């Protein structure tokens, strides 16, 4: 069936069909374009007219231009031939390596797995990152979220996780660049070639790449996450092996929806967002999951506009996660990296019956001492340290050492820290904080604990700091 | 006999820089059209019964019933080395009284940024000549680095010192080390832009600088357009194996001009009345700053966008929007400014997302750990405010931090060569300033720098050529600062 | 030809024309009014109908009422015979002294001087006001802005400047009253008659007055600043002479714009303002300028809604200025007049290469000590000054003396201070604050430095106390 463009306003294109009107979600092909331009049907406006969202720029479009109904939603290449390749929203190769040598395809719109398909298995996934492992550990096959305002360390952390978890992974990984920097896409692509996780000459590639960065119009940015996760769903269901799915940044899916919302004729909801924010997110998030058929460990970077965690976008995201790592500018500003808020990061498996009583007790002990110090800071800033009881100033000095021992040099952050990266075993993480809490290092200077790996390095640093 | 409303149309209404046009059946989205009077406009809204056209000029020149004619294409601008030394408007028209601009090349303003493949990692230093920037938040060629802060915190001055800094390279004959500059003024007053140009001419910097100016009394479409047009001029160098720097002064005013246009096109407002896609406005512009691989010439375009905050709130909507686009930011504060911290850079809140990869080995040697160290120093300074018993290690951390803070203070209009920066930082980072009174550090730096320029050009020239501090240079520096310091203390 | 009114809501009147449509900005004349009623064409709505903004009240207008096109924008008398006279928005004499028989008229809409016409000349204009001269000096031919909330001291300051600058100045002055108190215009007019800067018997007047006050509807308040500018533009260009332009109060221009925008049915911008706030301001402000052809030293009082400097009106005004004097209610309430915020007032000529290193160093030294005092306010407000270190106590004591030495009795504010007005030479201002910073008067009581002129008066005052 054939339609004609009747209106163009930014990324939103209205198309009239004299006969066979395409259903919502269908992919339409604009004729007379040099490069393929897909419109996705969003609404039926009435009068044989559909309202659509463009997957590429709308410059050059003319009222009267012919549009073909493909008879299906956007369909993309899936399967092992996506590994080591880079794809865009509509499935095209963007790596100058010729066609995606596949002939299995999948619609980017799909129903979420049902309640009966859910798995309740939850076992710890050790990261080698002290703050994460101690306080809010990740679970294999679980949903992990990395919250943060602009420039606090979401991407550095996700890259460190890819380094610490994915490089020694027994299955396949999918990375979805959603509304982020193209430079970061180039960085990651060449890094994985250098590491061999992508191989341009044999079939040993472990990672499939999907990108629609902040250079793209909102339709692209609204849909690239669906493309990225469709690739993941194939590896989960048709194989049954374990999959890692990394998304940076999932906020950009919601932001793109908000960019076109007024042009789709919607009254705004709170904070300028689309009224559909939560159901939109729900239909997308509920597909990102482990099932009885296969495991997905998902790690999603989540932007926090204006650093406000109550912003509808991040606020609605929390309920979709099993583990939350919340980054804070207030902490990053102090040179504490990773900038994890130890009093705002949580995990379903932070339970004495899962991690054991030792792990749980030390984690809660660390949180208590830090909350006690936080509550004191403001009082002592005005009335002075000398007004504190011996018990209070002991909790102050230990808390400040604990804050520092949570900081850690990342291998992927060597260009920022000037320190060699470190990976700390969970056993050593527990022991280290246990000893600080127990007052075993009360005699050591504060700075000995800053920017090190295991507790033995803090002792060595204290000796070095003497002379 | 005329019935053809395919290539032409008629003004239905005109007001506040928006013409609604009947006809123009064949007009393209974003196509430039021409009114009866000669005025141009862009077709931004294609609606079933009308075209919404934004007017590039004074709407008194448009009336109901006026014809509107198709041009055939989107906006473009003069492009090339003929623009260097010239002040132009948002469309590249000469506004400096020096004569018409005659380039052999033209370029479209609305082109999409290069994708993943044409790119290669930022690795070449873009030297500002500002100690605090080059050492703590280094900028490479192809990077985007935001300059952000309240009114009168020193934002433009960072960009100006940077442009003036390039003369050292541009006077030479090595084309891969040169940096051609573009200053885009958006929403400023003409007299300010004129004083800016006088400054760049007196420093003999205009000769390698294009000034693109859409000022406060220019129509909103011209201010909206100016950054993209300047960007196209810079992309010329980028795509021809050369290196350009572009300053957008400022993007806050561009967002305001775009907000007006959008509200008047009757596109419904979002947060703070800004259009729903105010992020996309800046993200598409800034993505076009890029470093090209050798296949595409190896050229680059570096962007320094400017954002004005209100009451120092870096965490605001539009600021964090732009922070979330760029590869770092330089954050300036009034508090620091008046304390004598000039440039007024907040270290902990400023970042570079390229880091040491954008530094010479020499700078990487002396400044490798300094940023995190200074961030930690400010935390300990705040905590130790009351004179309570402090251990030797914290006292040393405080002593060092106070002295390095003094070292990063710098005047205006004398951007420093990289080897000179390394030499001064060296004296601080190696501990030679630790026993000096904080008040006498600037005195030390002035006397020390002038001495090594006077007597040790062989050492400085070796650091500049090698791009590093060799073991021989390190031994020479060590001998110089030890004996110099012994004299200074008495 | 003739139009007919089709719609009226407050200042906004729609008019339909049968033959020939007036271009945007044209002045239309409403037929049958007792006093001239001008409508300015703002938009073409379609169907031969224009949307206009009235320059006076619209009460009594009827649908179908005839309107004529004058064939031009609002045109006003310009030239030497505007001197000594008062005119309204549309250039009518409002002083009961008959016709203003100028040889020329000018449209109130003119395009801003081009970039090529800009002057880069930066010369200090010494005011004799200590805070200004020391920290944020004014420049000859420069753009000066006086920011202030309700009742803090904008008008007193502009009146003191007219007292300190205009008499030392050799040229003409234009005062534009924009959305302020009519009785303030009456005061100014008659005081100028008394002093003789307006002469009713001779052609020796040196001031031209233009008024559209807070009794006027918004169309008049939005355009009257342009009327004032036009008068000044003539003296700048067609006489190539040094002009002083005083405007009280330029905020009222933007506020009036907000009122009309609401009636024009625009989608509103932030804080309920017109979406055109910045461009409207730019098109107006860019005309208030010195050019290569002639000098305008402009001083604009700038009202600050609810004391909020981040309000879009004052916030957008800053970048249009070369020097800013920001007043503070908190400072006024402490008794410091003029209530200038010494850490929020700036000048482009505050530059060692312009004012000399001595001036610059003392200014920055004063600001450093004041900032150091400021960021102790948290602790002082709770525990008082007695908890601070000896070092910090020294900085507090000197900063408090400097704060007081920055206050000054104005010739114009004698009823309120109770003191004779003082004007201080620049060299004396530099020297006085130099001596305080050096600790030369650490022994003197703080109150000695309050409401004096030169530093010698602070010494004499302390001697009478002890």
From Swiss-Prot, chain B:
Q: Which GO terms describe its molecular function?
A: ADP binding; ATP binding; proton-transporting ATP synthase activity, rotational mechanism
| Keywords, comma-separated and alphabetical | Acetylation, ATP synthesis, ATP-binding, Cell membrane, CF(1), Glycoprotein, Hydrogen ion transport, Ion transport, Magnesium, Membrane, Metal-binding, Methylation, Mitochondrion, Mitochondrion inner membrane, Nucleotide-binding, Phosphoprotein, Pyrrolidone carboxylic acid, Transit peptide, Transport
Question: Which residues are reported to carry the modification Phosphoserine?
Answer: 2, 13, 43, 103, 121
Please list the residues that carry the modification N6-succinyllysine. Answer: 98, 104, 167, 176, 198, 242, 364, 435, 443, 468, 476
Q: Does the keyword Heme apply?
A: no
Got a GO cellular component term for this one? proton-transporting ATP synthase complex
Q: Which residues bind Mg(2+)?
A: 156, 249
Membrane topology recorded in Swiss-Prot or TrEMBL: Peripheral membrane protein
Q: Glycosylation: which residues?
A: 13
Q: Which CDD domains match?
A: ATP-synt_F1_alpha_C, ATP-synt_F1_alpha_N, F1-ATPase_alpha_CD
SUPFAM superfamilies xrefs: C-terminal domain of alpha and beta subunits of F1 ATP synthase, N-terminal domain of alpha and beta subunits of F1 ATP synthase, P-loop containing nucleoside triphosphate hydrolases
| Residues carrying the site annotation Required for activity | 350
Write out the PTM section of this UniProt entry. Answer: Acetylated on lysine residues. BLOC1S1 is required for acetylation.
GO annotation, biological process: proton motive force-driven ATP synthesis
Q: In which tissues is it expressed?
A: Heart muscle (at protein level). Heart and liver.
Residues annotated as binding ATP:
152, 154-157, 410, 412
In-chain residues carrying the UniProt-annotated modification N6-acetyllysine: 60, 63, 69, 98, 104, 167, 176-177, 198, 242, 364, 371, 435, 443, 468, 476, 478
Record bears the keyword Cell inner membrane: no
> Where are the Omega-N-methylarginine modifications?
141
Give the note. The siderophore enterobactin (Ent) produced by enteric bacteria binds Fe(3+) and helps bacteria scavenge iron ions from the environment. As a consequence, the mammalian siderocalin LCN2 plays an important role in defense against bacterial infections by sequestering iron bound to microbial siderophores. LCN2 can also bind iron bound to endogenous or nutrient-derived iron chelators and plays an important role in cellular iron homeostasis.
Query: Quaternary arrangement and interactors, per the entry?
Result: Homotrimer. Component of the ATP synthase complex composed at least of ATP5F1A/subunit alpha, ATP5F1B/subunit beta, ATP5MC1/subunit c (homooctomer), MT-ATP6/subunit a, MT-ATP8/subunit 8, ATP5ME/subunit e, ATP5MF/subunit f, ATP5MG/subunit g, ATP5MK/subunit k, ATP5MJ/subunit j, ATP5F1C/subunit gamma, ATP5F1D/subunit delta, ATP5F1E/subunit epsilon, ATP5PF/subunit F6, ATP5PB/subunit b, ATP5PD/subunit d, ATP5PO/subunit OSCP.
Q: Which HAMAP family match?
A: ATP_synth_alpha_bact (MF_01346)
User: What family classification does the UniProt entry report for this protein?
Assistant: Belongs to the ATPase alpha/beta chains family.
NCBIfam families associated with the record: atpA (TIGR00962), PRK13343.1 (NF009884)
User: This chain belongs to which protein, by name?
Assistant: ATP synthase F(1) complex subunit alpha, mitochondrial
From Swiss-Prot, chain C:
Residue positions annotated to bind ADP are 151-156
Residues noted as binding Mg(2+) 2 in the record, renumbered to the chain: 180
Q: Which residues are glycosylated?
A: 48
Q: Does the keyword Transport apply?
A: yes
Q: Is this entry keyworded Ion transport? A: yes
Q: Which residues carry this modification: Phosphoserine?
A: 357, 375
On this chain, the residues bearing N6-succinyllysine are 66, 103, 201, 206, 464
Broad class of enzyme this protein falls into: translocase
Report which reactions are catalysed by this protein: ATP + H2O + 4 H(+)(in) = ADP + phosphate + 5 H(+)(out)
Q: How does it sit in the membrane?
A: Peripheral membrane protein
Family annotation (InterPro entries): AAA+_ATPase, ATP-synt_VA_C, ATP_synth_F1_bsu, ATPase_a/bsu_AS, ATPase_alpha/beta_chains, ATPase_F1/V1/A1_a/bsu_N, ATPase_F1/V1/A1_a/bsu_N_sf, ATPase_F1/V1/A1_a/bsu_nucl-bd
Q: Which residues form a coiled coil?
A: none
Which residues of the sequence carry a binding annotation for ATP? Answer: 151, 153-156, 181
Q: Which GO terms describe its molecular function?
A: ATP binding; ATP hydrolysis activity; proton-transporting ATP synthase activity, rotational mechanism
Residues modified as N6-acetyllysine are 66, 103, 140, 201, 206, 368, 422, 427, 464
Which Pfam families has this protein been placed in? ATP-synt_ab, ATP-synt_ab_N, ATP-synt_VA_C
Quaternary structure and partners: Homotrimer. Component of the ATP synthase complex composed at least of ATP5F1A/subunit alpha, ATP5F1B/subunit beta, ATP5MC1/subunit c (homooctomer), MT-ATP6/subunit a, MT-ATP8/subunit 8, ATP5ME/subunit e, ATP5MF/subunit f, ATP5MG/subunit g, ATP5MK/subunit k, ATP5MJ/subunit j, ATP5F1C/subunit gamma, ATP5F1D/subunit delta, ATP5F1E/subunit epsilon, ATP5PF/subunit F6, ATP5PB/subunit b, ATP5PD/subunit d, ATP5PO/subunit OSCP.
Family assignment from sequence similarity? Belongs to the ATPase alpha/beta chains family.
Q: What does this protein do?
A: Catalytic subunit beta, of the mitochondrial membrane ATP synthase complex (F(1)F(0) ATP synthase or Complex V) that produces ATP from ADP in the presence of a proton gradient across the membrane which is generated by electron transport complexes of the respiratory chain. ATP synthase complex consist of a soluble F(1) head domain - the catalytic core - and a membrane F(1) domain - the membrane proton channel. These two domains are linked by a central stalk rotating inside the F(1) region and a stationary peripheral stalk.
**UniProt name for this protein:** ATP synthase F(1) complex catalytic subunit beta, mitochondrial
């Amino acid at each position: 069936t054939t339609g004609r463009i009747v209106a163009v306003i930014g990324a939103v294109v209205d198309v009239q069909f004299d006969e066979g009107l395409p259903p919502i979600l269908n992919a339409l092909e604009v004729q007379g374009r040099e490069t393929r331009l897909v419109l996705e049907v969003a609404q039926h406006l009435g009068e044989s007219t559909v309202r659509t969202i463009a997957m590429d720029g709308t410059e050059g479009l003319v009222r009267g231009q012919k549009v073909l109904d493909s008879g299906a939603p956007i369909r993309i290449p899936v399967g092992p031939e996506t590994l080591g390749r880079i794809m865009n929203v509509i499935g095209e190769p963007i790596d100058e390596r010729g066609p995606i040598k596949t002939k299995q395809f999948a619609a980017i719109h799909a129903e979420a797995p049902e309640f009966v398909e859910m798995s309740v298995e939850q076992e710890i996934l050790v990261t080698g990152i002290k703050v994460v492992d101690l306080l809010a550990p990740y679970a294999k096959g679980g949903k992990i979220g990395l919250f943060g305002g602009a420039g606090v360390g979401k991407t550095v952390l996700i890259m460190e996780l890819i380094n610490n978890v994915a490089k020694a992974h027994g299955g396949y990984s999918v990375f979805a660049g959603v509304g982020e920097r193209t430079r970061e896409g180039n960085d990651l692509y060449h890094e994985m070639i250098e590491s061999g996780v992508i191989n341009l000459k044999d079939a040993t590639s472990k990672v499939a790449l999907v990108y629609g960065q902040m250079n793209e119009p909102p339709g692209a940015r609204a849909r690239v996450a669906l493309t990225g996760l469709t690739v993941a769903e194939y590896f989960r269901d048709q194989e049954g092996q374990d999959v890692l799915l990394f998304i940076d940044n999932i906020f950009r899916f919601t932001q793109a929806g908000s960019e076109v919302s007024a042009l789709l004729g919607r009254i705004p909801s709170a904070v300028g967002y689309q009224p559909t924010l939560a159901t939109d997110m729900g239909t997308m998030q509920e597909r990102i999951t482990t099932t009885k058929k296969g495991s997905i460990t998902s790690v999603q970077a989540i932007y926090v506009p204006a650093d406000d965690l109550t912003d509808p976008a991040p606020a609605t995201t929390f309920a979709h996660l099993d583990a939350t790592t919340v980054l804070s500018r207030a902490i990053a500003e102090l040179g504490i990296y990773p900038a994890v808020d130890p009093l705002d990061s949580t995990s379903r498996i932070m339970d004495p019956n899962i991690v054991g009583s030792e792990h749980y007790d030390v984690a809660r002990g660390v949180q208590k001492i830090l909350q006690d110090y936080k509550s004191l800071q403001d009082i002592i800033a005005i009335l002075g340290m000398d007004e504190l009881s011996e018990e209070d100033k002991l909790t102050v000095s230990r808390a400040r050492k604990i804050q520092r021992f949570l900081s850690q040099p990342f291998q992927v952050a060597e260009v920022f820290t000037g320190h060699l990266g470190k990976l700390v075993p969970l056993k050593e993480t527990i022991k280290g904080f246990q000893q600080i809490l127990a007052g075993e290092y009360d005699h050591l200077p504060e700075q000995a604990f800053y920017m090190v790996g295991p507790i033995e390095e803090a002792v060595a640093k204290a000796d070095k700091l003497a002379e | 006999t005329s019935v053809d409303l395919e290539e032409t149309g008629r003004v239905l209404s005109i007001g506040d820089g928006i013409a609604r046009v009947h006809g123009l059946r064949n007009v393209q989205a974003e196509e430039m059209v021409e009114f009866s009077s000669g005025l141009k406009g862009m077709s931004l809204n294609l609606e079933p019964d009308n075209v919404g056209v934004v007017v590039f000029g004074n709407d008194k020149l448009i009336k109901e019933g006026d014809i509107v004619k198709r041009t055939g294409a989107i906006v473009d601008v003069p492009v090339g080395e003929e623009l260097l030394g010239r002040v132009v408007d948002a469309l590249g028209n000469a506004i400096d009284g020096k004569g018409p601009i005659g380039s052999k090349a033209r370029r479209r303003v609305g082109l999409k940024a290069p994708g993943i493949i044409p790119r290669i990692s930022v690795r070449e230093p873009m030297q500002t000549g500002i100690k605090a920037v080059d050492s703590l938040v280094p900028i490479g060629r192809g990077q985007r680095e935001l300059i952000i802060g309240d009114r009168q915190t020193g934002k433009t001055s960072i960009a100006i010192d940077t442009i003036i800094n390039q003369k050292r390279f541009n006077d030479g004959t090595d084309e891969k080390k040169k940096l051609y500059c573009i200053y885009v003024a958006i929403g400023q007053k003409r007299s300010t832009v004129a004083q800016l140009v006088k400054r760049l001419t007196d420093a003999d910097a205009m000769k390698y600088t294009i000034v693109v100016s859409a000022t406060a009394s220019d129509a909103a479409p011209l201010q909206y357009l100016a950054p993209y047009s300047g960007c196209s001029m810079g992309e010329y160098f980028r795509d021809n194996g050369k290196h350009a720097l572009i300053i957008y002064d400022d993007l806050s005013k561009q967002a305001v001009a775009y907000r007006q246009m959008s509200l008047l096109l009757r596109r419904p407002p979002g947060r703070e009345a800004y259009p729903g896609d105010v992020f996309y406005l800046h993200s598409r512009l800034l993505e076009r700053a890029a470093k090209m691989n050798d296949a595409f010439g190896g050229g680059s375009l570096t962007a320094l966008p400017v954002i004005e905050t209100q009451a120092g709130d870096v965490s605001a909507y539009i600021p964090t929007n732009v922070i979330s686009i760029t590869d770092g930011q330089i954050f300036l504060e009034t508090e620091l400014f008046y304390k004598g911290i000039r440039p007024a850079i907040n270290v902990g809140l400023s970042v570079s997302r390229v880091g040491s990869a954008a530094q010479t080995r020499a700078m990487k040697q002396v400044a490798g750990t300094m940023k995190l160290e200074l961030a930690q120093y400010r935390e300990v300074a705040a905590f130790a405010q009351f004179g309570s018993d402090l251990d030797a290690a914290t006292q040393q951390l405080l002593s060092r931090g106070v002295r390095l803070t003094e070292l990063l203070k710098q005047g205006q209009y004398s951007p420093m060569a990289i080897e000179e920066q390394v030499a001064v930082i060296y004296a601080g980072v190696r501990g030679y300033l630790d026993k000096l009174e904080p008040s006498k550090i600037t005195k030390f730096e002035n006397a020390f720098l002038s001495h090594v320029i006077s007597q040790h050009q062989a050492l400085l020239s070796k650091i500049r050529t090698d791009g590093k501090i060799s073991e021989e240079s390190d031994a020479k520096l060590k001998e110089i600062v030890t004996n110099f310091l012994a004299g200074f203390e008495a």
